[model samples]
Target: PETAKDFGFITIDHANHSGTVRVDATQYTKWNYINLHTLQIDSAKVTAEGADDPDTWDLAIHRYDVKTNGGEVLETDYQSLSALKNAGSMPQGIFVADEWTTNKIAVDVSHMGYLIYAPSDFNPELSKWLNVDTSEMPPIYTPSNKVYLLRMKDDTMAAIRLVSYMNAAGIKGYMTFDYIYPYEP
Candidate 1:
C-alpha cells in the first residue's frame, strides 16, 4: 500500500502495515530517518540539525559527545552499578539494567534485552562523532530519561524517548523521536 495520506511519522498503523516482513515506506521514513524514496545517503542534504520541510535526506545522528568548552569525555557503563558508583555521575548509556526489574536503559547488561552501542559513534566518517559536534549531543545537567537504543533493520539505532536540555536557540531538539527495529540483545 502507498503511504496513506499525509503521514509525518511512523505510527502503529505503519508497523501494522508490515506483514512480519517489510515495513511500509512511511515506516521507513521515520525509522531510517530518510525521505524522497531513497535508501542511500546523499551527504549534501544529510544534516546534523533539523532539516527543511519535506526534507530528503538521512538520519539525525545522536551520540554522546561532550561540551567543547570544557565538557568531560565521560563514558559510564550504565550497565555496571559499580561503574556508576565509581564515577559519581548519573547513567550515561542506554540499557535497562540487566536482571533488575527497575528497567534502567544501558548499552549492555540491562535487565531487559538490548544493546546501545552505535558503531557510527565509533565510525570516523560521521562528522558528529568525529568532531564531537556540540549540536549533536545533549547539554550538561541533562536529566536521564527512560529510554534505550533499538537497532533498526537499515543499520541505524533507534533512540526512543530521548530527552535533552534546551539549547541557546530554545529548541527542544532531542525531546521527540520515532524509529523501530528488532529487540536484539
Candidate 2:
C-alpha cells in the first residue's frame, strides 16, 4: 500500500539569482524532485521506482544524498556564493554528472541478527555533498560546505552552496541551501 507522500519546497529571488530550498527527505524511501529553474518541487516518489519525467527536474534529494537530472556538478574551493560569483571564471575541476551505479544496502536477517548487502540503483557522483561517519553508532553527517558549479539542464552554470542538512528541530533530511543562478562569471 502506497500511503506516504511528502514533497519539498523552495524560495527564490530571480533578481538576485539566489534561492533557498527546504527538502522534505525525512522519508528515506522517497526522492524529492525539484526544478531549480522554476523553483518548484516537481514530485516526491520512491527513488527505487525512478522519476516519470527525469528531464523535468534539476535535482533530487533523498536524505543527505543528491542527484542531478542531466546536469553536472563541480565542487569548488570558494567558501561562499558571493566569493564564487566574483571569481571571474568557473573554477577548474572535473565536473561530474549523474550515472547509473549500484548501491549497496544493508539487509537484516531477522533470526540471524546480522546484515547482508543488497544491490540497488544509485548515482554516486552527485551524492558526494555529504559525508557519513559510520564510526558513530547511528552515524554522523557532515556537509562539505563547499560551493559547487552546477551546469543546469540548459547548460547554464550556477553557483550553489549547501547550507544545512537538518531543520531547526535538528531533524535530518531537511536540506537547506542557497544558490546563485545565471552565475555571471
Candidate 3:
C-alpha cells in the first residue's frame, strides 16, 4: 500500500488532502530540557512569589485532547495564563506546583510549560534518557488544534520511559499551551 504521495510528482485525484493533516516534526526541533541532579526528585516547591529554582528541575512534553462538558471536541489555542484566567475556562485535569504542599494549584499559561534547563553535568544521562539528539533539539514548536502538558519526571530515565509510552500510544507531540496549567507548581 502507498502511505504517501510518490517521491515527487503530484496526483490530485489520489490525494485526499481533506480533513486535518497532522505532522510529527517535534523531534526535529531543539526543545530539550533536563535536570540531572534533581532527577530523583518527583516534585519541587515553587517560590511564594511563583517561581522555580531553575537549577534542579525541568519539564517533559505530554500531549492531551481538549473536550467540552458535553463531550464536544473544542479547538484550543495557546494563549497566555493571564488571558486564560480572565476567560475563566481552564483546562479540565491538570495541576502545577509552585510551592511545596500545594498539590493542586491552578497554573496560568505564562508559567505552564517553560523549558527547564538542566545542569551540564547530567547531559549524557539526560540525553540518553530522553532519547534526544542534541543536534536535533532547540526549535521545538507545537502543532495547532492540540493541547500539551509539561510534566516533571523523577529522573532522565523516567522521562525517557514516559516518552516511549507516549510514542507507543500514538501521541502527536507535546505543546506548552499558553492558557492552561494543570500542575500545582
Candidate 4:
C-alpha cells in the first residue's frame, strides 16, 4: 500500500486512512515518541527527555524497533484486523513488557565498500511485528501480520497492526501501522 504517502516525522490519520501513525525512521537519528491516548507526537523528535516521560508517550519507534514507556504487548492468534475485531471474546495470549535486548540494523556504506550491522537498544516483545531473515543476501522482512494488543500505562487497551514496513517504493525504514485505541469488548 503506497505507504510513502503517509511517511513523515509523525503522521496520524484516522478518517481517510487506516488510522495510521507513520514514522519516518529512514535516518535512524532519533526515536519518534507517540502518545497513543491523545494521538499526538512529541515536538522533541529525538530526546532522552521526551523518551523518558512514560506519562507523555506510550510508544517510541526508531527504524524497525519499538519500545513502550510503561505498558504490555501481546501478539494475538488473530491474523487479520477484521478477524480480531470480530472475535467473540478477548483472545487469550501472554502479554509481555519492555525488556533490554540488542537490536540489529543494516547499514549501506557503498563508499566504505562494505555493509555493516550496528547493534543498538531494542525491545524484545514488540520486535515480533516483523521478522528479519538474514539468509537472503539483502535480507527479507516478513511481517508477522498478527494483530497486537497494547496495554498502555493507564490500563488502556488498544489493537494495533503493523501494516507495512516499507513504502510503495519499497523503501525500508518507513513504519506504517493502524490502531484502535482504548479498545472495547
lDDT of each: 0.27, 0.68, 0.26, 0.68
**Tens-place lDDT digits, model 4, residues 1-185:** 54544454244455522366777766544666777767776523333222333347878777777777767888988777678767867878788887644324333335344544444344566778988887898888889888888888788887888888887788897788877776766
Best TM-score goes to which candidate?
2
Candidate 3 Cα errors over 4 Å, as ranges: 1-31, 34-55, 60-82, 93-142, 145-147, 151-185
Backbone clash total, candidate 2: 0
For model 2, what is the alpha-carbon lDDT of residue 14?
Answer: 77
Ranking by TM-score: 2, 4, 3, 1
lDDT of 4: 0.68
Candidate 1 vs candidate 3, lDDT winner? 1
Using TM-score as the yardstick, the better of models 1 and 2 is 2
Ranking by lDDT: 4, 2, 1, 3
Instruction: Score candidate 1 by TM-score against the native.
Output: 0.19
Which candidate, 2 or 3, has the higher lDDT? 2
| lDDT (Cα) of model 3 | 0.26
Over 7-91, each residue of candidate 3 has an lDDT whose tens digit, in order, gives: 1111111132111112222342122232323222122232223333234434322122111111111222433333333554444
Question: Which runs in model 4 stand beyond 4 Å of their true positions?
Answer: 1-18, 43-55, 102-121
Query: Model 2 segments beyond 4 Å from truth?
Result: 1-10, 47-55, 104-125
Worst 10 residues of 4 by lDDT: 43-52
